[PDB]
Amino acid sequence: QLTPFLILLRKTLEQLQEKDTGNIFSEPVPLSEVPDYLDHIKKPMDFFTMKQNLEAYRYLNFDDFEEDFNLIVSNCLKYNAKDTIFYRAAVRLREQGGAVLRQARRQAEKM
């Protein structure tokens, strides 16, 4: 059932965004500040874009939702040098997001 699944994904997305304590992943990487970003990153992702995708019915199973969270992280590791707060924040986001995604998947796989 689409409606309760979307409610679950909204809740899960809020839980993931609460882990972004640096407010680093909440909106697209701004090309005005990072002009070469697209030379390197084929599919940019961020929590605002995930919210738009959610309401546009782009996530119809948990896997596709989790895939895009994982892209937030992997894009950041790929673009930024290891010594940067951006890279380190992405490592932390992955670590903190794990439990959120694990629990939410079980709730989805009860439906």
């Binding site: 640096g22 680093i24 990487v29 500040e33 990072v34 002009p35 070469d36 970003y37 030379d39 390197h40 673009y79 930024n80 040098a81 940067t84 707060i85 951006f86």
Partner: peptide, 8 residues
């Protein structure tokens, strides 16, 4: 490997 972002 990239331009980088400005230090936060």
């Amino acid at each position: 490997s990239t331009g980088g972002k400005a230090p936060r």
